[PDB]
Design a protein around this ligand. Structure first.
Ligand SMILES: NC(=O)C1=CN([C@@H]2O[C@H](COP(=O)(O)OP(=O)(O)OC[C@H]3O[C@@H](n4cnc5c(N)ncnc54)[C@H](OP(=O)(O)O)[C@@H]3O)[C@@H](O)[C@H]2O)C=CC1
Ligand SMILES: Cc1ccc2[nH]cc(CCCOc3c(C(=O)O)cnn3-c3ccccc3)c2c1
Ligand SMILES: [Co+2]
Length: 159
């Protein structure tokens, strides 16, 4: 199984300037819960976005997708292709915008956190993948983050 997990503003932005313009501590815990014990596949720019203190993310097989044959990610696996990374029972693609789109054909689950931040789309932003007709969503309650933004969980499944 391959899943995608991302947080987006209502507009669809997931990243800007190489990072995320919000931090919901409740979303950080949900990500650990859903990913713990499994393979996380991330692009090179998102691995760069991980603080060196926290990477690799513990309890998980960190796989970094890159076109650089010399790029090294200490404590992670660097592979040049996405399915070179899909050899475990359950795989989660943890970003970013480029790898979400590259992994969407392989994906049957999208765990999406919608952050009620009014953030207009702008050039150079990373955007969430477009989910087509095949995706069925189940929606959760609007909840309050301690960071002051509303959020809610969207679970997308497809056969
Ligand atoms: N809101 C959220 O939940 C999340 C937000 N983000 C944000 O997303 C942004 C980064 O996303 P983005 O800019 O799209 O970059 P990515 O994280 O998707 O990494 C892209 C890189 O991966 C390599 N790559 C891309 N396609 C391929 C391919 N077919 N084969 C092999 N390698 C490939 C390349 O690395 P190389 O150039 O070295 O060859 C490319 O530069 C950041 O702001 C991040 O914080 C990240 C995770 C989730
Ligand atoms: C890369 C990525 C992609 C999509 C995502 N959606 C939700 C998150 C929250 C991620 C928290 O990731 C973690 C861990 C952990 O997962 O164990 C330990 N520390 N950090 C951590 C990381 C960066 C800053 C500060 C703390 C996310 C992350
Ligand atoms: Co699990």
């Amino acid at each position: 199984m391959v899943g995608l997990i991302w947080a987006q503003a209502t507009s669809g932005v997931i990243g800007r300037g190489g990072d995320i313009p919000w931090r919901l501590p409740e979303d950080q815990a949900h990500f650990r819960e859903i990913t713990m014990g499994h393979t996380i596949v991330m692009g090179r720019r998102t691995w760069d976005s991980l603080p060196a203190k926290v990477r690799p993310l513990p309890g998980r097989r960190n796989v970094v997708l890159s076109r650089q044959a010399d790029f090294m990610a200490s404590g992670a696996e660097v592979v040049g292709s996405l399915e070179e990374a899909l050899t475990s029972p359950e795989t989660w693609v943890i970003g970013g915008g480029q790898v979400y789109a590259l992994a969407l054909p392989y994906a049957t689950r999208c765990e999406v956190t919608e952050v009620d931040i009014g953030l207009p789309r702008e050039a150079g932003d990373a955007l969430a993948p477009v989910l087509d007709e095949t995706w069925r969503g189940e929606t959760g309650e609007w909840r309050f983050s301690r960071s002051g933004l509303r959020y809610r969980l969207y679970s997308y499944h497809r056969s």
